[PDB]
Design a protein around this nucleic acid. Structure first.
Ligand SMILES: CC(C)C[C@H](N)C(=O)NS(=O)(=O)OC[C@H]1O[C@@H](n2cnc3c(N)ncnc32)[C@H](O)[C@@H]1O
Ligand SMILES: [Mn+2]
Ligand SMILES: [Zn+2]
Length: 771
RNA sequence: GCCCGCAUGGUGAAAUCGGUAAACACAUCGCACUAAUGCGCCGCCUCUGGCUUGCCGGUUCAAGUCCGGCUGCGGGCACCA
């Protein structure tokens, strides 16, 4: 009988008009910043988002009721591959597709009653965001954090773009699922390697992150310890430093072998063999038979001072150490050759390092971050290339460099490179005719710092230091573990960079990270367009209302565990919510007779009122603590316990205790089921919005009732329980316990040695052996 | 190979600190008012008693919880030198 199809909207408008969710930095309440991973604008809102975002809203609504000044914002991850591929697949320009998805997602969110501070909305594709990011790019470029280099990068032949190492998963492209290849090409990078030590060591301080996410990052960065041994070439200047962990076996080396892509290859079957390995996909390059080619030349071991053969082999992987190995048949080198140690490593490197012929080596798996993409739909790189002057920043006056409106979908090079009038630019140094950078920034550049932009999303400065340093770091960040070595690496990296450059005074973006579980279909399969099992949230919200949808997702299981979604699944929550409504409509006489919004000690005329009052106080405490640690399902169980309590014992309760309990019940329920809660609050005669009511606090007079159920152990084993008055003297407790028949029986041939009494919790009697 | 996480009834699961294991729901069954609603049973056994949080131990007055070792599942990095 709650008409959600008109009433949800009615309450949403009430909350809007009171500005409940508008973040005000000049508010005096203690600051709280809760956010969730902002969505790609690749389609409509899906049920998984609803789960992810419901959790943030529930928390935010509670923290608002508790007096915090809460920033809970939302915006749109709208550039790069995801939006762009979805727009291509549909047949529309990505600007038009993106805007439609924004508009659809924002509408779905508002209809769910999600309480975002919309004044803080942003979209990474808007000119205002582009201006900010281009400024940030040019700052990082001036300080040497961003640089151009002509080196090996991953290439996705189906996306037709370069990809970052983090966007290569199981040798495949992040979005295409196509085998990735490696090309040498001039590209833009960020020097994340130079921060790799801080990224790795500062994991120890992130106690609010899951140890799983932390360990996944530890392995991604992949710091290794070993030794570099320099190997001189005969009729030549420069050496080739090999890398090993088994330095101990240095004199044991029968050979040296190189990576096909190594700088120093400075002829028939060499350049033929190499280009044959270098043509292989990243997948193929790791598997199959081992191969190689004798260089011809030879090279020296400066311990032994004695000559060694040089080779070029496929089993040397280019992304580990120096790309030179140092072989001994280590059964990698044994298959190749057919075609008592620790303090030894100490003294060896002493000899080598003191006579400049080797050293201690720290290596990282982490590759520097490729950000340039040969794609239309991303942030232009604000660089002009001049045949005279080289790479030149666009002047701040010219910012932002916006995309041309028309996209050219066929031709050579990158899509922007085909647009001759867009590409034409004056060199800002000499004034000659020059060319814009033809590439765009990867989507993970946008999302690496967006959380620092929400506090003033239309400012001509990228980041408002003074606002940010008050509202951030974010207290709570909610999103999927799939970002563990994408956005959660990059965001930590860019936070440190911006810290060091003065934008902010904190070094880590997110205090507490929570990873919501997957929402799957009823059979446990990932939802996807290709399986035709994508839930439409609007259909479910239309049938059941927003509250029932959100409470099913929150009550179904632990926050971090998978849900197998059923479209009829919210029916049981809807039924629970109607049972709450009926408890109000049954007691409406009593409600309209008392203004009580909670229970006072003077309202309790007996032991039954005090049992009720007590249960409510526990429920306040438990709901409060559980929301803040994301135990939403246990919080909702506590409210259902109260609800059962009131069905069972209400009506024997004094009217005032019952009106207070019911009003208290709806106050606790509000963060979970906000619309129905406003309805019931109003129906009970309140004029205010419950969403604006201070959150309940434990009345410490009502927390213990008159009697306590105390379990009794003997030697740690539960025997029975005993009900006693609260504040019984410890000697009277013991004397009462020793009098229980079960206890008198079990001690009739045994001596009492000790007891452990934990007040109002337990008594364990420590007893000797059978006489 | 190297690193990490997890394990509780038919089912989803609960349990700040070590303190009555299974709260709260879903399913089936039963009861009361002719579907709705209210309400009840609902881990096991050789059942007056006694067990039970995958397995074996340790710590402690006390272990689902802490420590050690297994087994099983999940995840991460790797022709990783
Ligand atoms: C910060 C930025 C790099 C994020 C990036 N723009 C992005 O990932 N956008 S997004 O739309 O794919 O995801 C948004 C949020 O929604 C979660 N989610 C998605 N599907 C499900 C699901 N089936 N079940 C549970 N959660 C889901 C997902 O994990 C994430 O936190
Ligand atoms: Mn293995
Ligand atoms: Zn010039």
């Amino acid at each position: 009988q709650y008409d959600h199809r008109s009433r949800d909207a009615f309450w949403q408008q009430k909350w809007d008009e009171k500005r409940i969710f508008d973040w005000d930095p000049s508010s005096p309440g203690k600051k709280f910043y809760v956010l969730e991973m902002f969505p790609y604008t690749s389609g409509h809102l899906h049920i998984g988002h609803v789960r992810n975002y419901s959790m943030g809203d529930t928390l935010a609504r509670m923290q608002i009721a508790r007096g915090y000044s809460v920033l809970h914002p939302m915006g749109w991850d709208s550039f790069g591959l995801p939006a762009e591929n979805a727009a291509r697949k549909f047949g529309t320009h990505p600007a038009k597709f993106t805007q439609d998805a924004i508009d659809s997602m924002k509408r779905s969110m508002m209809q769910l009653g999600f309480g975002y501070s919309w004044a803080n909305e942003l979209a990474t594709c808007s000119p205002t965001y582009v201006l900010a990011q281009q400024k940030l790019f040019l700052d990082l470029y001036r300080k040497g954090l961003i640089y151009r280099d002509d080196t090996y990068v991953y290439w996705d032949p189906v996306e037709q773009t370069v990809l970052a190492a983090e966007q290569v998963i199981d040798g495949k492209g992040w979005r295409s699922g196509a085998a990735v290849y490696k090309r040498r090409t001039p590209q833009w990078f960020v020097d994340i390697r130079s921060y790799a030590d801080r990224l790795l060591d500062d994991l120890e301080s992130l106690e609010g992150w899951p140890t799983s996410v932390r360990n996944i990052q530890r392995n991604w960065i992949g710091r290794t310890e070993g030794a570099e041994v320099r190997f001189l070439v005969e009729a030549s200047d420069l050496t080739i430093n090999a890398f090993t962990t088994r330095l101990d076996t240095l004199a044991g080396c029968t050979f040296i072998a190189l990576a096909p892509e190594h700088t120093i290859l400075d002829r028939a079957s060499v350049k033929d063999y190499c280009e044959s390995i270098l043509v292989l996909s990243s997948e193929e390059r790791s598997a199959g038979a081992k191969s190689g080619i004798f260089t011809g030349l030879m090279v020296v071991n400066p311990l032994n001072q004695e000559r060694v053969p040089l080779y070029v082999a496929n089993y040397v992987m280019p992304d580990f150490g120096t790309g030179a190995v140092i072989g001994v048949p280590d059964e990698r080198d044994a298959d190749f050759g057919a075609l008592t140690s620790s303090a030894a490593r100490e003294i060896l490197i002493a000899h080598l390092s003191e006579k400049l012929e080797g050293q201690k080596s720290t290596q990282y798996r982490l590759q520097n971050w490729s950000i340039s993409r040969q794609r239309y739909w991303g942030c232009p790189i604000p660089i002009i290339h001049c045949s005279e002057c080289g790479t030149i920043p666009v002047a701040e006056e010219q910012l932002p460099i916006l995309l041309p409106d028309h996209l050219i979908s066929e031709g050579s090079g990158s899509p922007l490179s085909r647009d001759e009038s867009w590409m034409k630019a004056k060199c800002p140094q000499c004034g000659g005719d020059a060319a814009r950078d033809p590439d765009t920034m990867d989507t993970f550049v946008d999302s690496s710092w967006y959380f620092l932009r929400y506090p003033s999303p239309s400012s001509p400065n990228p980041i408002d230091s003074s606002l940010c340093n008050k509202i951030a770091p974010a207290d709570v960040y909610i999103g999927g573990i799939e970002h563990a070595t994408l956005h959660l690496i990059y965001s930590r990296f860019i936070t440190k960079v911006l810290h060091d450059l003065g934008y902010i005074e904190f070094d880590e973006p997110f205090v507490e990270l929570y990873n919501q579980g997957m929402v799957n279909d009823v059979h446990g399969r990932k939802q996807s367009k290709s399986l035709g099992n994508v839930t439409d949230p609007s259909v479910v919200v239309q049938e059941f209302g927003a509250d029932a949808v959100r409470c099913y997702l929150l009550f179904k299981t632990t926050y971090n565990a998978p849900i197998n979604w059923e479209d009829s699944g919210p029916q049981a929550m809807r039924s629970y919510l109607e049972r709450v409504c009926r408890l109000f409509t049954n007691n409406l006489d009593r409600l309209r007779s008392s203004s009580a919004i909670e229970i006072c000690p003077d309202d309790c005329e007996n032991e039954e009122d005090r049992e009720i009052a007590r249960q409510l106080q526990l429920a306040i405490g438990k709901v409060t603590a559980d929301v803040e640690r994301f135990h939403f399902n246990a919080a909702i169980a506590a409210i259902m316990s109260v609800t059962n309590l009131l069905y069972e014992k209400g009506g024997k309760a004094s009217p005032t205790v019952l009106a207070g309990s019911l009003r208290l019940l709806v106050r606790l329920l509000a963060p979970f089921a906000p619309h129905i809660s406003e309805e019931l609050w109003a129906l009970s005669g309140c004029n205010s919005l419950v969403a604006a009511e201070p959150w309940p606090t434990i009345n410490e007079r009502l927390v213990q009732a008159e009697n306590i159920v105390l379990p009794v152990q003997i030697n740690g084993k539960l025997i029975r329980t005993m009900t006693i008055p609260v504040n019984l003297a410890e000697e009277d407790i013991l004397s009462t316990v020793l009098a229980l028949p079960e206890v008198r029986s079990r001690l009739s041939d045994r001596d009492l040695k000790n007891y452990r009494y934990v007040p109002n919790r337990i008594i364990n009697l420590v007893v000797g052996l059978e006489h």
